[PDB]
């Protein structure tokens, strides 16, 4: 999470933005539209010509909300609650795009703040925009509901004794489908039937079993694992999405009756939650 050192850095940088916030917000959108043209699909109803009043208007609204987030840095979910609802329920902008605007906001600040944009401020601003994006997307699916917890516990119970086997299959699927993930195991024999793969799949599955048994207290239960990935293994966060996908594929292939649309949705939410915890201490 944002440290108090992060919050001080963010408040210094944004203070310096001051009255140009609206202008910078409009610059960030234009940079986004030019560099990542797929983002224009969310604004077919705008005139996106340079300097358009719509773009200027939206730029200032974007910047207002960031100013609000900065001024309520310790209470972000609460303070941006209306904005969260609107993106989750109405606009329904795919979460990938929040990363693209954050990058363009960062480029904009760099281009206007030569004195302030030091390495540590850069890192803090990046973390802050990632936190904002997390809050704005937190209601798309929300936290795990009691139906979700029930669904995950039933599906995993059905998995039972085969949890280890399924974990190894998921890894094998991951290595074959996403070969970049192999770069984290140069020290393994990754051939089919490898005992190194089986032994690791058992460890992964046992940790998931531990998480299911502690669905409400997952950060503590997974704390040692969070430490280990953040500070030793240092697996790029992108890779957790790929294993989650292959875990889901594995469960689907073995659970013909249990893998209903609702259970699929709950499982996808659960593994995203697990991935969130495991990367929580990276930064």
């Amino acid at each position: 999470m944002l440290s108090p050192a992060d919050k001080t850095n963010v408040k210094a940088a944004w203070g310096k933005v001051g009255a140009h916030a609206g202008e910078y917000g409009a610059e960030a959108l234009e940079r986004m539209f030019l560099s990542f043209p797929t983002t224009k699909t969310y604004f077919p109803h705008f005139d996106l010509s340079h300097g358009s009043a719509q773009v200027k208007g939206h730029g200032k609204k974007v910047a207002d909300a960031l100013t609000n987030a900065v001024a309520h840095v310790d209470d972000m979910p609460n303070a941006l609650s209306a904005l969260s609802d609107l993106h989750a329920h109405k606009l329904r902008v795919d979460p990938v795009n929040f990363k693209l605007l954050s990058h363009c906001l960062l480029v904009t600040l760099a281009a206007h703040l030569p004195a302030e944009f030091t390495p540590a401020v850069h890192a803090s601003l990046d973390k802050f925009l990632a936190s904002v994006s997390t809050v704005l997307t937190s209601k798309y699916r929300g936290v795990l509901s009691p139906a979700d917890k029930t669904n995950v516990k039933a599906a995993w119970g059905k998995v039972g004794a085969h949890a280890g086997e399924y974990g190894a299959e998921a890894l094998e699927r991951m290595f074959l489908s996403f070969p970049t993930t192999k770069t984290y195991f140069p020290h393994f024999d990754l051939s089919h039937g490898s005992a190194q793969v089986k032994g690791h799949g058992k460890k992964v599955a046992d940790a998931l079993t531990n998480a299911v048994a502690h669905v409400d207290d997952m950060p503590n239960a997974l704390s040692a694992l969070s430490d280990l990935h953040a500070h030793k293994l240092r697996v790029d966060p992108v890779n957790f999405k790929l294993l989650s996908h292959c875990l889901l594929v594995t469960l689907a292939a073995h659970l013909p009756a249990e893998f209903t649309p609702a259970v699929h949705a709950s499982l996808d939410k659960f593994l995203a939650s697990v991935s969130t915890v495991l990367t929580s201490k990276y930064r």
Binding site: P37, Y42, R173, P256, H264
Partner: protein, 146 residues
């Protein structure tokens, strides 16, 4: 796009058993349930409030059938995905305004549905081949966005 002989064989053998209507309805329906923000394109489809309503929605079924029918046609032209999908790419970019990230979400769900339907036959090597194909189709559909 290029696949190894074993990969192409893997893809075409499995697809011969796919009833496009059935799998198509299922893949689109799960997309709408698992990633509900994708419902932003289907406001005119009716009741999408719950998993059961989505899965039983006849307009969902028919659209899924249409979508996977086109996908099916793509598998017959693996060698030139861009040329095969260019017109539909333009359609999706300029008229429908669909964020190409949706093509990738649909790809992920489709792989899940094949695993669910076929079980043990959807082995790790068969999945790898299909992951290359859904990625190549999503890239082909995203090509005309400017």
């Amino acid at each position: 796009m290029h696949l190894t002989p074993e990969e192409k064989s893997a893809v075409t053998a499995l697809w011969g058993k796919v009833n496009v209507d059935e799998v198509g309805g299922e893949a689109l329906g799960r997309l709408l349930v698992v990633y509900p923000w994708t419902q932003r394109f289907f406001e005119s489809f009716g009741d999408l409030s719950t998993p059961d309503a989505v899965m039983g929605n006849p307009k969902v079924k028919a659209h899924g059938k249409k979508v996977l029918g086109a996908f099916s046609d793509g598998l017959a032209h693996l060698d030139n995905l861009k040329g095969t999908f260019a017109t539909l790419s333009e359609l999706h970019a300029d008229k429908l305004h669909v964020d190409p990230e949706n093509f990738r979400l649909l790809g992920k769900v489709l792989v899940c549905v094949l695993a669910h339907h076929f079980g043990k036959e959807f082995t790790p090597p068969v999945q790898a081949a299909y992951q290359k194909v859904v990625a190549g189709v999503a890239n082909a559909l995203a090509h005309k966005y400017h």
